[PDB]
Amino acid sequence: GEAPNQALLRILKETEFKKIKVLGSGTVYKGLWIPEGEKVKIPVAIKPKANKEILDEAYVMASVDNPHVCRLLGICLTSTVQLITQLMPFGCLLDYVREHKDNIGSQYLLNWCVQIAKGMNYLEDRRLVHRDLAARNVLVKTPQHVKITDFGLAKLVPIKWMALESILHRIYTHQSDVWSYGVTVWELMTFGSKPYDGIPASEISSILEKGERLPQPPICTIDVYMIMVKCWMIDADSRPKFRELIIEFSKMARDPQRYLVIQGDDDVVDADEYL
Numbered sequence: 315g316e317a318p319n320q321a322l323l324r325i326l327k328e329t330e331f332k333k334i335k336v337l338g339s340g341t342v343y344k345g346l347w348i349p350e351g352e353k354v355k356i357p358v359a360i361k362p363k364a365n366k367e368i369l370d371e372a373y374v375m376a377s378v379d380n381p382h383v384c385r386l387l388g389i390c391l392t393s394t395v396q397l398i399t400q401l402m403p404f405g406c407l408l409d410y411v412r413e414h415k416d417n418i419g420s421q422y423l424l425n426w427c428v429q430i431a432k433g434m435n436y437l438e439d440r441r442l443v444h445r446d447l448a449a450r451n452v453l454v455k456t457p458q459h460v461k462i463t464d465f466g467l468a469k470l471v472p473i474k475w476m477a478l479e480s481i482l483h484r485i486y487t488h489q490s491d492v493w494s495y496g497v498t499v500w501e502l503m504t505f506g507s508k509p510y511d512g513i514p515a516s517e518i519s520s521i522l523e524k525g526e527r528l529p530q531p532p533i534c535t536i537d538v539y540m541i542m543v544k545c546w547m548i549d550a551d552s553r554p555k556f557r558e559l560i561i562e563f564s565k566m567a568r569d570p571q572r573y574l575v576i577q578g579d580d581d582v583v584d585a586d587e588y589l
């Protein structure tokens with residue numbers, strides 16, 4: 315009794331877009347997409363067995379439409395399978411936060427938390443479990459506007475971001491995503507620290523069983539840290555809902571310095587305007 319997935323799968327002529335540079339290495343390039351009969355230029359990222367998987371990704375990305383999730387613009391079916399998406403010029407948020415450590419205020423950190431919760435709440439609406447929420451998989455369109463990406467694991471192994479019940483019984487829920495939301499917030503609040511750094515993943519299951527959790531980040535008031543901790547409750551239903559994380563961080567974002575203590579407080583069209 316599910317709704318029909320009427321998303322459109324756009325097939326792009328490879329002559330419609332111009333690669334311009336490698337961004338990473340699986341390979342992602344920067345380029346420009348010029349819809350043939352349209353006077354627009356669109357900044358884009360361009361990304362058996364392997365083909366099957368990347369098309370699962372294309373499936374998920376084409377089926378989401380929300381200001382805080384990356385949506386597939388199209389695929390190109392040439393010698394290889396290329397996913398074409400909105401270019402996120404500032405890269406992923408894990409790198410971004412490490413590079414600008416000394417220039418990120420409480421307002422930005424809390425706003426990122428709100429926007430990521432909105433993206434995740436949207437995916438919950440769409441009955442989608444991301445299964446790989448993490449700061450590396452959140453992209454930065456502008457410092458003011460981040461979006462969740464990498465749906466290569468989503469469904470309707472990153473041990474250090476995973477709910478305990480996922481490490482134990484490979485169970486995954488919107489509430490196991492909340493757990494990953496909490497590890498991702500911890501990544502941001504520590505300006506990109508590696509969680510459980512030095513602790514091999516084999517030990518993670520046991521550490522979490524003894525009751526250990528990531529420590530309280532220096533800039534974090536107990537209010538913010540307490541929210542993180544709640545995402546790490548053993549009882550998955552005792553963890554916050556995304557719609558609540560949105561609300562709580564919204565409140566905090568209205569007075570950020572009360573919640574984070576930080577020393578120093580032509581013819582181009584962005585994809586978001588190409589509908």
Ligand SMILES: C#Cc1cccc(Nc2ncnc3cc4c(cc23)OCCOCCOCCO4)c1
Nearest residue numbers: 337359361397398399400401402403404405464
């Ligand atoms: C289709 C598709 C698809 C599916 C999953 C992930 C991505 N990934 C991306 N989507 C949009 N824009 C990006 C911009 C990047 C980038 C990756 C991007 O590479 C991060 C490495 O750091 C370089 C920093 O350079 C600045 C810009 O880099 C694309």
